[PDB]
Amino acid sequence: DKEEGGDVKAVCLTLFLLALRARNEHRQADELEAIMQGRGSGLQPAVCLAIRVNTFLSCSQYHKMYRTVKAITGRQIF
DNA sequence: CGGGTTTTTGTCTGGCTTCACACTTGATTTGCATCACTGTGTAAGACAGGCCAGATCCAG
């Protein structure tokens, strides 16, 4: 917070990417980049909105599907 | 119109990873084209024509 402005999460993921590249890995690096950016392993709200609308899903139906996926998989895809 | 002072970076430098890259063939798994059909088209209004009724007219 003294000289680097004061953003904690930024320094955190930067140090993690540096320590990861130290191990010269690309798989994990790309995974965390996609997670932190919001492009892989998890849909944007507009994307799931388009899916729910263009497939005629009811709100109740969509909630049922969301609940089932979250219960079985354990990871929030929608 | 271009001098100071940190940012922003590709290297120099050579030596350690973790993935990349030739071949099979028999499956196994995805991806995509094809075919006979579907729904949404969904109540009233204008006009001519036959028919008596009753008004319009005729003549003893």
Side-chain angles (χ1 to χ4, degrees), chain A residues 1-20 22-78:
Chain A
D1 62 357
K2 290 180 181 179
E3 191 273 331
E4 343 261 296
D7 191 358
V8 175
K9 184 273 299 292
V11 175
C12 290
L13 87 156
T14 299
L15 293 175
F16 184 78
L17 292 174
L18 293 175
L20 192 152
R23 315 163 256 250
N24 24 315
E25 293 179 353
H26 295 285
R27 166 252 324 261
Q28 255 255 101
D30 292 331
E31 290 180 354
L32 186 145
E33 182 66 27
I35 297 299
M36 253 30 248
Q37 184 62 255
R39 324 141 66 280
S41 225
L43 281 72
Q44 295 296 321
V47 175
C48 64
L49 182 62
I51 295 170
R52 160 192 176 298
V53 172
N54 203 164
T55 59
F56 296 97
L57 288 171
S58 178
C59 183
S60 296
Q61 254 29 299
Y62 181 78
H63 181 74
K64 289 173 69 176
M65 182 179 72
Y66 157 94
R67 118 247 257 43
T68 300
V69 173
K70 184 177 179 181
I72 295 170
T73 301
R75 294 177 66 188
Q76 255 205 353
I77 301 299
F78 309 87

